[PDB]
């Protein structure tokens, strides 16, 4: 089986740890990103989000409440594990930005990939 | 200021109501697709996510476990208010489906957008 | 039967002419956007793609080259035709932006929508 | 400089062949997918495409109209030269499936990466 639960890092150095999951399949978390618009200002940020519970290779969703910043990432994806029981959370994304109005709308989704294997 | 907390439709007829926003953003709800692979299975599905809070008109994001797919959705967007205090939550989505193994990992994500009106 | 040769407005409000649709479904058209980063630059950008020929409804892309900044959208969608002749191609795009190393590549792809419909 | 002529492969072992890229930066091409809905049918299939012209790590867009699918993919990224010479062209894309009518239009684009490195 593939549970959420532990540290994870990305193909960006990016850092997440994630929390129980419960038996709905909802987990917390914090999210460490090594990147950011002002990455000067980057803090410690609270995730929350959904896994299957069944499934042995789970899809899930998560967002990611950027605490120094007025955008909110989601990520979605599904956890494999492979012949020798490597996990790995195959990921996609999208970051909105917060405009000052509906006319800016246009331009305020961003969209990329990332790939996660466990810290330890 | 532009809230969540209510019940919305959306460009395809889906619906979705979103229960209390806490201190931390973070809100629950219940979520109706009018479309679906198999739309004959469609049953009501849970959401959990979080917006910003102070911003009058927030980013957010949101997890849809679809309760009769092994997909996920997550959801992710911002919520205006127009001059006479009309809202409209513009978002973009994801749409992840489960797949066998990595290797058909770039076939397994949807794109698309919607746009959410309150209901009455 | 769906044919993208004409003129066309999408929900933004911007224009585009598709010239003659070849053997092989490859046309050329031009572009004015309607919005921008720095909307004071606009100037007719050239694009470029192909479409399906046999499908009644054909899917198609193509490609912006801007010809007032280092970005570039592709386009990619499906013209339908309804019970009355009405065409409207319904699309989703990229917007890469250029950035100045691989480093920042994360940050560089802007996703959305775009219905465009007949001008006359 | 980087200009998108000559041959490349990707992350999933796909393999496409650009030809001279004019002044205006269009391109024409080939593109040999690994992978398809049905690999069965794959066939070498022709791309047509803009890079910017002037700039040292242009942006691209390219269209590639699979020749044994009523699909068509959309490309778009930038070429990046490394301090040694290396060339990578970093992409996101858009796949747009024929569906049979509008009221199935949602579940019609999906999204995905690719890396790209020079074949030899
Ligand atoms: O910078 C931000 C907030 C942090 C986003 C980190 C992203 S989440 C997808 C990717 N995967 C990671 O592990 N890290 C990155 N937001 C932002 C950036 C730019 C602008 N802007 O206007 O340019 C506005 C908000
Ligand atoms: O059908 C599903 C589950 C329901 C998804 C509804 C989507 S969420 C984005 C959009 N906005 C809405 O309000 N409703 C739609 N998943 C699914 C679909 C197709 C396949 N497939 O393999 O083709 C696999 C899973
Ligand atoms: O502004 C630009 C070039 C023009 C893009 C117009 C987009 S194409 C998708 C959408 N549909 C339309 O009809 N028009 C819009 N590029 C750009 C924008 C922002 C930034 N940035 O750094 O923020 C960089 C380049
Ligand atoms: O299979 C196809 C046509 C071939 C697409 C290959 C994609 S292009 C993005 C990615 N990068 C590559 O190098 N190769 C892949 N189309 C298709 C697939 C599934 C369905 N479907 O209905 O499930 C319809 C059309």
New interface residues.
């Given amino acids: 089986k593939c549970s959420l639960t532990g540290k994870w890092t990305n193909n960006?150095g990016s850092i997440m740890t994630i929390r129980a999951v419960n038996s709905?399949?909802?987990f917390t978390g914090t999210y460490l990103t090594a990147?950011a618009?002002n990455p000067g200002n980057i803090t410690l940020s609270?995730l929350?989000?959904?896994?299957?519970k069944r499934?042995s290779?789970?899809?899930?969703?998560?967002?990611?409440?950027w605490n120094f910043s007025?955008?909110?990432?989601?990520?979605?994806?599904?956890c494999?594990i492979?012949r020798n029981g490597k996990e790995?959370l195959?990921t996609?994304?999208?970051?909105?930005?917060?405009?000052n109005?509906?006319?800016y709308?246009?331009?305020?989704?961003?969209?990329?990939?990332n790939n996660f294997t466990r810290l330890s």
Avoid: C, N
Wanted: proline letters at 4%; glycine letters at 10%; a negative charge.
């Fill in positions: 960006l709905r399949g909802e990147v618009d609270p929350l989000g959904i896994q299957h499934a290779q789970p899809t899930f969703g998560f967002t990611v409440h007025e955008s909110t990432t989601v990520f979605t994806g599904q494999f492979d790995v195959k996609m994304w999208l970051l909105r930005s917060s405009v109005d509906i006319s709308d246009w331009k305020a989704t961003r969209v990329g990939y």
